[PDB]
C-alpha cells in the first residue's frame, strides 16, 4: 500500500489521476517523481518549469552543476537528481521533442528509465509542447514501464480523452 489517491486503474501497473503533478508531489512527496527534461536540463517551461518554480529555482541550479561536470543527456536518456521540497529524488528523463525534429522512436527508450524504480509519480512524456500525439505516449508507456507508474494528467479534457480512448 502506498500514498497515491483518486487515480484510476489502467493496467496491473499504470495508474492516471486528473491532477497537476506539482500538487500531486506537494502532498504525497513520492520517492521519485519524473521531469520531463530536455538535453541540458533547461527548465524553462511545461512540467519542467513548473517543478523548477516550485523548488524556487533550486532544481535549476543543481542541473546546472550537472550539466557542467556531465555535459548533456541523451534524447531517451535520464539522470537522478534531488527532489528537493517535492520528492526524495527526481529522475529527469528526456522524451523525444517533435518540434524540434526528435525521432518519436525514442519515445520507448526514454519510458524505459522508469524501469529502474519501483514506484514513479510521473507526466506523460514527449506530449503537450514536445510535440507528440499523448494518445500514443500513453500507449508506449503502458507497453514499455513494468514498475508502478502513477501518471498526473492536468488538462482535463485530455485526460477524459485518454481514458475514453485507452485500449
Ligand atoms: C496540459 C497538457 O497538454 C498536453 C498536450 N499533448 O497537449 C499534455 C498536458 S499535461 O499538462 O497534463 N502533462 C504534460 C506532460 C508533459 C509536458 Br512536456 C507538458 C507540457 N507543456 C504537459
Given at each position: 500500500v502506498n500514498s497515491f489517491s483518486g487515480y484510476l486503474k489502467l493496467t496491473d501497473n499504470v495508474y492516471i489521476k486528473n491532477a497537476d503533478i506539482v500538487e500531486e508531489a506537494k502532498k504525497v512527496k513520492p520517492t521519485v517523481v519524473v521531469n520531463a527534461a530536455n538535453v541540458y536540463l533547461?527548465?524553462?517551461?511545461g512540467v519542467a518549469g513548473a517543478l523548477n518554480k516550485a523548488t524556487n529555482n533550486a532544481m535549476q541550479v543543481e542541473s546546472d552543476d550537472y550539466i557542467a561536470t556531465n555535459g548533456p543527456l541523451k534524447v531517451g536518456g535520464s539522470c537522478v537528481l534531488s527532489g528537493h521540497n517535492?520528492?526524495?529524488?527526481?529522475?529527469?528523463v528526456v522524451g523525444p521533442n517533435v518540434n524540434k525534429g526528435?525521432?518519436?522512436?525514442?519515445l520507448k527508450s526514454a519510458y524505459e528509465?522508469?524501469?529502474?524504480?519501483?514506484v514513479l509519480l510521473a507526466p506523460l512524456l514527449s506530449a503537450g509542447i514536445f510535440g507528440a500525439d499523448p494518445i500514443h505516449s500513453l500507449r508506449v508507456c503502458v507497453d514499455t514501464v513494468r514498475t508502478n507508474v502513477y501518471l498526473a494528467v492536468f488538462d482535463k479534457n485530455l485526460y477524459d480523452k485518454l481514458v475514453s480512448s485507452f485500449l
Open positions: 533547461k527548465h524553462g517551461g517535492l520528492a526524495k529524488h527526481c529522475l529527469h526528435e525521432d518519436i522512436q525514442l528509465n522508469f524501469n529502474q524504480h519501483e
